[PDB]
Design a protein around this ligand. Sequence first.
Ligand code: BQ1
Ligand code: BQ1
Ligand code: BQ1
Ligand code: BOG
Ligand code: BOG
Ligand code: BOG
Ligand code: BOG
Ligand code: BOG
Ligand code: BOG
Ligand code: BOG
Ligand code: BOG
Ligand code: BOG
Ligand code: BOG
Ligand code: BOG
Ligand code: BOG
Ligand code: BOG
Ligand code: BOG
Ligand code: BOG
Lengths: 86, 86, 85, 86, 86, 85, 86, 86, 85
Amino acid sequence: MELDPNALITAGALIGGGLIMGGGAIGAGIGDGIAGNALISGIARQPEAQGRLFTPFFITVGLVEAAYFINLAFMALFVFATPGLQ
Amino acid sequence: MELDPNALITAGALIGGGLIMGGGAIGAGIGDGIAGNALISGIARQPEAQGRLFTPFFITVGLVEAAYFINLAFMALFVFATPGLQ
Amino acid sequence: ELDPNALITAGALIGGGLIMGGGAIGAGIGDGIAGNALISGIARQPEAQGRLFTPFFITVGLVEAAYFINLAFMALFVFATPGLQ
Amino acid sequence: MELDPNALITAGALIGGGLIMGGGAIGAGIGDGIAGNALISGIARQPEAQGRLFTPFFITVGLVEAAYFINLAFMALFVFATPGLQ
Amino acid sequence: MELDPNALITAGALIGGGLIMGGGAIGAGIGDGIAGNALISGIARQPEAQGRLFTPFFITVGLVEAAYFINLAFMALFVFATPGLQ
Amino acid sequence: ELDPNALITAGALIGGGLIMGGGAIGAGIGDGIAGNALISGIARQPEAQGRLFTPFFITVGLVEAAYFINLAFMALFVFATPGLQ
Amino acid sequence: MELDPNALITAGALIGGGLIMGGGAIGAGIGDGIAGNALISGIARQPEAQGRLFTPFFITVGLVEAAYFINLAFMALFVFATPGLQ
Amino acid sequence: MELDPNALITAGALIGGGLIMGGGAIGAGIGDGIAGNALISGIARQPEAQGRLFTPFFITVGLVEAAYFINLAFMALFVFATPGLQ
Amino acid sequence: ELDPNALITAGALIGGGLIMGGGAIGAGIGDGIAGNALISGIARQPEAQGRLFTPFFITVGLVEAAYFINLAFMALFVFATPGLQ
Ligand SMILES: COc1nc2ccc(Br)cc2cc1[C@@H](c1ccccc1)[C@@](O)(CCN(C)C)c1cccc2ccccc12
Ligand SMILES: COc1nc2ccc(Br)cc2cc1[C@@H](c1ccccc1)[C@@](O)(CCN(C)C)c1cccc2ccccc12
Ligand SMILES: COc1nc2ccc(Br)cc2cc1[C@@H](c1ccccc1)[C@@](O)(CCN(C)C)c1cccc2ccccc12
Ligand SMILES: CCCCCCCCO[C@@H]1O[C@H](CO)[C@@H](O)[C@H](O)[C@H]1O
Ligand SMILES: CCCCCCCCO[C@@H]1O[C@H](CO)[C@@H](O)[C@H](O)[C@H]1O
Ligand SMILES: CCCCCCCCO[C@@H]1O[C@H](CO)[C@@H](O)[C@H](O)[C@H]1O
Ligand SMILES: CCCCCCCCO[C@@H]1O[C@H](CO)[C@@H](O)[C@H](O)[C@H]1O
Ligand SMILES: CCCCCCCCO[C@@H]1O[C@H](CO)[C@@H](O)[C@H](O)[C@H]1O
Ligand SMILES: CCCCCCCCO[C@@H]1O[C@H](CO)[C@@H](O)[C@H](O)[C@H]1O
Ligand SMILES: CCCCCCCCO[C@@H]1O[C@H](CO)[C@@H](O)[C@H](O)[C@H]1O
Ligand SMILES: CCCCCCCCO[C@@H]1O[C@H](CO)[C@@H](O)[C@H](O)[C@H]1O
Ligand SMILES: CCCCCCCCO[C@@H]1O[C@H](CO)[C@@H](O)[C@H](O)[C@H]1O
Ligand SMILES: CCCCCCCCO[C@@H]1O[C@H](CO)[C@@H](O)[C@H](O)[C@H]1O
Ligand SMILES: CCCCCCCCO[C@@H]1O[C@H](CO)[C@@H](O)[C@H](O)[C@H]1O
Ligand SMILES: CCCCCCCCO[C@@H]1O[C@H](CO)[C@@H](O)[C@H](O)[C@H]1O
Ligand SMILES: CCCCCCCCO[C@@H]1O[C@H](CO)[C@@H](O)[C@H](O)[C@H]1O
Ligand SMILES: CCCCCCCCO[C@@H]1O[C@H](CO)[C@@H](O)[C@H](O)[C@H]1O
Ligand SMILES: CCCCCCCCO[C@@H]1O[C@H](CO)[C@@H](O)[C@H](O)[C@H]1O
């Protein structure tokens, strides 16, 4: 008739999922930008020895992107396999 | 007009979609500004390093913008193909 | 009492506000950070001025793209709400 | 009697409007502070050639303040000419 | 006591007003601290530049505080003269 | 069931929390940033100490003004709620 | 039977209290980290004269922690002595 | 199943608890990263200052982590011993 | 209609989302800031490399601890909700 329990649960899941991905993008965009800031400046300062900067950059971006995609996976769980759905 | 389940689900979807895109823009705006800060500073320090520095700059911006547009895709999923709609 | 669109529209306005609120945080801070580098760059090399304009405009262009794309979707949310009944 | 549709829409509009102006002030306060940080430091470093810093500062503040006031305009739309009001 | 439309509108106004002032303080506190960071650093670097540096400092703080107090004015509008009150 | 003031008071407490939450973010980070400059300034010039106190106190004064003005309005929101029925 | 007024007020109080402490920890963690960043760097640069850094550090941390604990006190008021409870 | 007061109180507690821990992690992650930035930079600048620099680093991390775990304690209070439960 | 657990579970999912949203903000920015120092440190002293690994890993370890402890409590919130009726 009117509302049912899953309408409220699903609304909660979509808001929760949004928080997860919203936070993920804040962390990833700013974290990657900060890492890349050092890469750009390091290459500017030391063009001949820049190769040694790339594994540290990719380790850093790897960590940052792992947070983004682990969050993405839990957003997908929230909205496609909602825990507590009735 | 009686409330119905999709009214609540759609309200949650729009809020969730807003969180996704709001966070996306925070990460992209600040991440791109931080990347650009190093680009601008590097060119100011060494004029002829301009070509050299656009390469790590675009790698960084690529990473930052990937977050923005993956978030955009999921906002679109939330509001145009809402998971859990009844 | 209430009707379905009252709830949907309330959600759209909150969603729209999140979109624009986040857009201004990203654009204001991103542009400030870009301009910080422009100002410092010019102070360091008073006639580096000319060569700094292109990277400043590219950076601001990217930052402003996020603001404007968000603005467009806020407009969609509140003027053509997806899911309106 | 009890609630009416516009009570809920208007509550949404006020919360939305608050998000718009809250975010606008975060972006403007921090963005202007960051721009002014460079202005202060530049004037400290180069008092004789500081005049060339002011158009770049005002362009930057112009961009930052434009975000604040465009947001202000949409807050005013949300709360004084609410889209979707019944 | 039955709920009434203004109860919901006023709740939205208070939340909206809180967002406005919460964001205002984030922008003002951090923006002023960032401006002051350059002032303090500049005086440490060159003692007799103190007078010189307060001028761009107060221009910056003026901009930052304008955001805070314009936000304050609209919080006051929201909670004392609520747009849309029935 | 419910009554009008239950909803208004719930909104006031959420609004009050936003005010103080934002106030502490601004004050904690703003003060930390001001103190960062004070500490670095003293480390650079160990007897610049005296001349740094005034600009530090002016900066902290401004930051703390935002915290305290927010505190006052949180108090208004929760102890004298505007719009209470 | 169903809901009562204090259920809604108490839910508001817990959310409000959460906002207070959530914001308090953001301000304290980042503020202390920023202060400590300068302490670490200052001690690195000037090991012999580092003692003069500690009162400025503790004044700064004092200010930052005061925001955290004043917020904590108001969270405690919100959730243990809720203003407006019926 | 009819709604009951504790359903609403517990929902508020979980949201409040989430705000507490969400803010705790923002402050701790960023505060610790900022502290570590000075540690790493200081060791890079002067290798044998390593021992010296861990002392102010752990003082800083102690302060930052205190915020995280005091917040954790109050999240636990909110969700396991909810103040105001009926 | 509704039942008590619909409201509790909706709160748990929102709470869980706040926990993980905040966790990723802290971890992404904290790790980026740590890596920024690692990259700059190596660029300054190309064979400082070895001695920078330990402080980098300690910093990342602390940052990641916040992410993981948050993850565990999100899991508690949504898979074993405290207060479920
Ligand atoms: C760097 O990795 C770590 N460091 C830690 C440091 C301290 C503590 Br106390 C916990 C830590 C835990 C971990 C991981 C881990 C490894 C194994 C099991 C559980 C957790 C991690 O949490 C990292 C997530 N980061 C990158 C945002 C993780 C979580 C979830 C899914 C993952 C998938 C793939 C890889 C890592 C995954
Ligand atoms: C710098 O300006 C831009 N750069 C962009 C860069 C990339 C992309 Br893809 C879009 C961009 C769009 C714009 C503007 C624009 C110009 C014309 C039409 C539409 C949009 C803008 O969005 C800027 C807002 N900023 C400052 C926060 C704008 C929006 C709304 C109202 C405005 C009023 C006055 C001035 C600008 C106004
Ligand atoms: C530095 O202290 C200040 N500077 C200001 C600067 C400008 C303005 Br306009 C107001 C200012 C107000 C104050 C304090 C104050 C002193 C006396 C009375 C009222 C307020 C303060 O607000 C500081 C909180 N900070 C540290 C987050 C405070 C509030 C509440 C409880 C406190 C308990 C103990 C100490 C300070 C306490
Ligand atoms: C915590 C950061 C660890 C980064 C990896 C450091 C160990 C590998 O270091 C790598 O050594 C190679 C040769 O062996 C070089 O060609 C690479 O430039 C360098 O990154
Ligand atoms: C984010 C994508 C938009 C980029 C548009 C401008 C691309 C500029 O591209 C860059 O131009 C420089 C000169 O300005 C050259 O020196 C560089 O080699 C080139 O990469
Ligand atoms: C994407 C483009 C963003 C531009 C931001 C608006 C400010 C325009 O900046 C203009 O740039 C010119 C280039 O020579 C300068 O000479 C002008 O003085 C300046 O007004
Ligand atoms: C992108 C934001 C500006 C363009 C908004 C989309 C077009 C506006 O759409 C119009 O808005 C009017 C009020 O302005 C309403 O009264 C009308 O019903 C509506 O058609
Ligand atoms: C800025 C780019 C995206 C803007 C999308 C806005 C779509 C607005 O769409 C408009 O909605 C109005 C009612 O609000 C109607 O009167 C118009 O017929 C309709 O075209
Ligand atoms: C993107 C930033 C563009 C800033 C404007 C640069 C072009 C104008 O530059 C201006 O030239 C004047 C004389 O012509 C000088 O008196 C000013 O100091 C200088 O700002
Ligand atoms: C934000 C407004 C509050 C400011 C109060 C203090 C004003 C200080 O004013 C400044 O004092 C300096 C010495 O301390 C002088 O050298 C400067 O010329 C003067 O501008
Ligand atoms: C707006 C004022 C903010 C002050 C913050 C509280 C710390 C007071 O700081 C005091 O400043 C004195 C000035 O000489 C120092 O000598 C004292 O050691 C110090 O305790
Ligand atoms: C600015 C924050 C501190 C001052 C709060 C405003 C005055 C407090 O007001 C009092 O609060 C009491 C609990 O403390 C309530 O029990 C009383 O009903 C109320 O009169
Ligand atoms: C800190 C500056 C602004 C504080 C505004 C607080 C106003 C509190 O006002 C007080 O409310 C109490 C009930 O809570 C009543 O008992 C008192 O009569 C009333 O004066
Ligand atoms: C605003 C910052 C004020 C910090 C306090 C400065 C005044 C006291 O300064 C203190 O003087 C002592 C001897 O008198 C020294 O032993 C301490 O190292 C020094 O901090
Ligand atoms: C946050 C607590 C976890 C810390 C675990 C590692 C502790 C490292 O401890 C440090 O090790 C250094 C060499 O690496 C020594 O030079 C320092 O004296 C010592 O403090
Ligand atoms: C708490 C530990 C966090 C580690 C982050 C994952 C990256 C591991 O980094 C590894 O460190 C090694 C140390 O010598 C390097 O030699 C390897 O090249 C590198 O892959
Ligand atoms: C820490 C996050 C990963 C571990 C999650 C806790 C264990 C999962 O728990 C299981 O989740 C399933 C879906 O994955 C549900 O279908 C099951 O009902 C539930 O038992
Ligand atoms: C990651 C460390 C904390 C994880 C806490 C997760 C507790 C999950 O607990 C599990 O919940 C499932 C239903 O969701 C049940 O099927 C299982 O019986 C139960 O053990």
